[PDB]
Amino acid sequence: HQFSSLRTPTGDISGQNKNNLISGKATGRVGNYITVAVEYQQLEEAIKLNQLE
Amino acid sequence: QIPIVGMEQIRGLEKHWEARNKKRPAFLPLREVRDKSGNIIAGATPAGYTQ
Amino acid sequence: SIDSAVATYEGFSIRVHKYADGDANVQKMRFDLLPAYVCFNPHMGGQFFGNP
Amino acid sequence: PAVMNQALAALLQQTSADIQEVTGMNRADMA
Amino acid sequence: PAVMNQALAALLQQTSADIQEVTGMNRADMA
Amino acid sequence: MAETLEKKHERIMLRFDRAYSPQKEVREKCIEATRFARVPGGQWEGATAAG
Amino acid sequence: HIPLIPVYGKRWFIDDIERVEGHIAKAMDPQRLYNLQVSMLADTAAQDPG
Amino acid sequence: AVGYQLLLRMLSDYSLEPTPQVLSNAQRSYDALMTDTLVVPSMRRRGDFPVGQGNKYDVFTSDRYYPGDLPLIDGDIPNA
């Protein structure tokens, strides 16, 4: 929040305006999923795939 | 618990009901229930009480 | 909820209140008393003056 | 006449028991 | 005839118990 | 090297602010508990004037 | 040494912050609810005597 | 709804008598009118009711209890 002051010779602030409390927010949102997908046949795993890690 | 009454039943008598625990009345007055034609349907008892 | 005290003078008690107005930013004080008189019998008093 | 509901009495009993229960070899037994 | 409502009796018993409860190694146990 | 006392004082002030900032709710609860247990009118504090 | 000698009732260290507890903290809610129950009972009892 | 209520309140001017079917239609229209304008006040808390210790209140925020009305104090008119 932010405010403002007043200047009076004696402190009488009866007839002037007072600071109001206007509140604001910052809104964040989620994005889109990040997906990496692979596939391979069962025979390939047994005969033609090594060092999968 | 609070009693439930009708406006036409209790109107004009609220000053006696508002102070039944401070003063010590001999009785409490209340009217009857009437139809649109003026016939009497129910007694002077309150309709019910809240739970 | 007002700051108060009492004071004494010649056997009489006086109540003092101290308060303030915030917006005008002023401070004020008051002292209060309440008397009461009775007259029992008028035939037991009066005014006297010297005879000529 | 005025009446007392069961919920108020149950709350009275429960709180009165719970305050005492919460508020408290031989030395280890003491609070 | 007259009647005694439940709330008054409940308050009577409750306050009678609370007075005695509030108003009070053997020496340490004394009030 | 903080030759002047006006240079030594604000370091103390920042140190006090740093020490005060985290330990504020523990002492909060301690003061609340003491006031609740000992002040003769403290068990209803927070709503003393209500109606 | 610093001549301050601290005394604690019960002390723990949970999340980078010292925490302490005495003997009155744990029973505040039942007491402040019992008081309200008693007050509400008294008001209702006094409302309608007979 | 408005038309049927007006017909009910104005039919006596020409000295006729409404029929039960018209009465039922008027009642149904009035019920449809009243359905759309409900209130359901949904009563609040009391005001001295304690709020839980699990809500984690603070000193300068007060709210040890649900908010309620607060007295007016004046030092010039001795109401007391």
Side-chain angles (χ1 to χ4, degrees), chain A, chain B, chain C, chain D, chain E, chain F, chain G, chain H residues 1-76 78-80:
Chain A
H1 275 126
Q2 299 191 52
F3 299 96
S4 66
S5 64
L6 286 147
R7 307 299 297 261
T8 69
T10 181
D12 175 1
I13 52 178
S14 66
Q16 293 82 17
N17 265 317
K18 310 208 170 193
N19 301 113
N20 61 6
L21 308 186
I22 307 166
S23 297
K25 72 201 187 69
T27 285
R29 215 171 331 280
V30 304
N32 311 335
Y33 284 41
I34 311 167
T35 296
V36 179
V38 304
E39 65 183 1
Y40 56 94
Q41 286 184 317
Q42 196 200 358
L43 174 71
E44 251 132 33
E45 185 192 357
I47 68 167
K48 274 172 324 252
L49 262 180
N50 45 99
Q51 291 193 293
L52 206 64
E53 294 294 328
Chain B
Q1 277 184 336
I2 305 106
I4 304 168
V5 292
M7 301 135 298
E8 69 157 0
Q9 212 182 0
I10 194 166
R11 178 58 67 99
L13 295 170
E14 309 98 310
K15 75 210 202 293
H16 291 297
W17 278 74
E18 65 183 1
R20 65 200 192 239
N21 66 306
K22 306 179 190 56
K23 292 162 161 38
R24 320 173 84 218
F27 54 89
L28 281 182
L30 197 58
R31 288 166 206 134
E32 293 83 3
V33 183
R34 283 164 209 280
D35 192 73
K36 82 197 191 194
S37 191
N39 299 131
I40 297 176
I41 291 161
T45 184
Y49 289 77
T50 194
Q51 300 293 117
Chain C
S1 69
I2 288 173
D3 200 357
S4 87
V6 305
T8 181
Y9 199 59
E10 310 295 329
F12 285 82
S13 66
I14 300 169
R15 180 165 281 264
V16 54
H17 281 106
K18 314 188 275 290
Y19 58 109
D21 184 0
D23 272 1
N25 200 324
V26 301
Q27 279 158 179
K28 40 183 84 78
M29 293 177 70
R30 61 175 294 153
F31 304 75
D32 316 289
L33 189 140
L34 179 47
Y37 319 101
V38 301
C39 187
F40 294 131
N41 203 353
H43 302 159
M44 321 183 88
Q47 323 161 8
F48 77 98
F49 291 106
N51 45 35
Chain D
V3 293
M4 182 179 72
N5 44 357
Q6 315 173 9
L8 195 141
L11 271 193
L12 281 179
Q13 275 170 251
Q14 203 54 75
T15 44
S16 192
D18 273 28
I19 283 179
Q20 170 56 85
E21 180 193 280
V22 171
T23 46
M25 283 73 74
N26 218 31
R27 272 163 274 289
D29 292 328
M30 319 287 256
Chain E
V3 293
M4 174 203 49
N5 53 5
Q6 324 203 60
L8 190 152
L11 268 172
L12 271 178
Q13 306 292 2
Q14 205 50 71
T15 60
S16 192
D18 300 323
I19 286 288
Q20 172 155 31
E21 183 178 1
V22 181
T23 68
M25 291 155 158
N26 200 37
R27 301 229 283 161
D29 289 331
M30 312 206 158
Chain F
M1 187 66 204
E3 182 77 20
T4 61
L5 277 299
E6 59 195 48
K7 181 69 176 177
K8 288 192 174 73
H9 195 260
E10 76 276 17
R11 293 205 298 106
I12 291 170
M13 284 295 105
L14 314 184
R15 280 180 168 180
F16 170 61
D17 287 327
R18 288 206 302 109
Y20 171 46
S21 173
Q23 277 285 299
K24 191 182 288 184
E25 284 82 349
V26 174
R27 323 286 189 109
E28 206 272 1
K29 184 60 69 178
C30 299
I31 298 298
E32 167 166 278
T34 53
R35 195 161 258 279
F36 186 91
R38 297 313 200 196
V39 166
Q43 297 206 324
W44 276 100
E45 281 178 8
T48 309
Chain G
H1 306 299
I2 301 299
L4 300 186
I5 316 296
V7 187
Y8 302 98
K10 280 170 287 188
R11 179 200 179 259
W12 312 286
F13 204 94
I14 297 296
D15 272 17
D16 190 359
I17 291 296
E18 183 178 1
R19 307 183 184 275
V20 308
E21 178 149 69
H23 203 78
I24 308 290
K26 280 203 290 190
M28 293 177 70
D29 274 342
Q31 172 81 87
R32 70 162 70 247
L33 192 62
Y34 175 82
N35 292 339
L36 169 67
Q37 292 315 304
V38 167
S39 297
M40 293 177 71
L41 177 60
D43 197 355
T44 293
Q47 184 141 320
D48 195 358
Chain H
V2 173
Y4 275 118
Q5 293 309 125
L6 176 61
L7 170 61
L8 288 201
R9 288 272 207 85
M10 211 186 56
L11 193 143
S12 293
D13 216 331
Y14 306 92
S15 66
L16 286 90
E17 190 141 8
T19 176
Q21 186 42 57
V22 160
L23 277 159
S24 281
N25 293 11
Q27 164 271 299
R28 183 165 261 190
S29 283
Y30 194 89
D31 189 280
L33 172 63
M34 281 265 268
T35 302
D36 203 58
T37 69
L38 261 173
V39 180
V40 182
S42 170
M43 50 199 298
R44 314 291 291 241
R45 296 291 190 271
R46 186 168 165 86
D48 55 15
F49 190 82
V51 74
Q53 201 172 185
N55 278 12
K56 282 182 183 178
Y57 39 75
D58 202 328
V59 298
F60 195 60
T61 311
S62 173
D63 61 50
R64 224 81 61 81
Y65 298 80
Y66 282 97
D69 312 277
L70 199 67
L72 185 135
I73 297 143
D74 203 328
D76 217 357
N79 267 342

